[PDB]
Amino acid sequence: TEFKAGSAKKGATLFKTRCLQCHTVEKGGPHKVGPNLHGIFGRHSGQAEGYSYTDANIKKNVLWDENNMSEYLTNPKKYIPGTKMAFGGLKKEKDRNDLITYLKKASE
Numbered sequence: 060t061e062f063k064a065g066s067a068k069k070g071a072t073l074f075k076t077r078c079l080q081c082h083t084v085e086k087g088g089p090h091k092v093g094p095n096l097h098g099i100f101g102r103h104s105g106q107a108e109g110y111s112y113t114d115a116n117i118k119k120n121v122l123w124d125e126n127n128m129s130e131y132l133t134n135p136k137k138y139i140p141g142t143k144m145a146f147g148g149l150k151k152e153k154d155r156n157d158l159i160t161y162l163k164k165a166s167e
């Protein structure tokens with residue numbers, strides 16, 4: 060496979076128009092529909108301190124890396140059969156990478 064970085068930029072609005080709808084990547088961030096992913100990159104699937112997640116996402120114990128996160132976002136409901144990621148997903152090629160890199164910019 061090839062992740063490759065690319066150029067966040069669009070990734071910002073993308074997040075703001077895709078993920079942020081349910082999420083945020085902010086420090087004192089709420090948990091609206093989905094939990095804040097502030098530095099998610101580094102932990103495993105089901106950390107937060109409040110959210111408590113689904114048994115699926117938890118028991119998945121999947122690591123969040125630019126690579127793994129990619130497939131997950133490409134199609135999260137398939138990757139985690141039981142997440143409440145009610146999400147469109149990032150089955151593109153560029154938009155996806157722009158987002159992964161954006162997240163890394165927003166909080167590595």
Ligand code: HEC
Pocket residue numbers: 074077078079080081082092093094096099103104105106107111112113114116117123132142143144145146147148149158
């Ligand atoms: C609402 C319609 C959502 C959209 C759009 C996105 N996400 Fe989401 N996400 C949502 C929920 C309700 C949950 C919790 C389910 C669970 O138990 O995991 C999630 C979870 C995630 C996770 C996992 C959290 C963790 O393991 O700590 C990630 C990494 C995640 N979501 C990322 C993510 C991104 C980057 C999105 C835009 C591309 C996105 N989500 C959209 C709900 C919704």
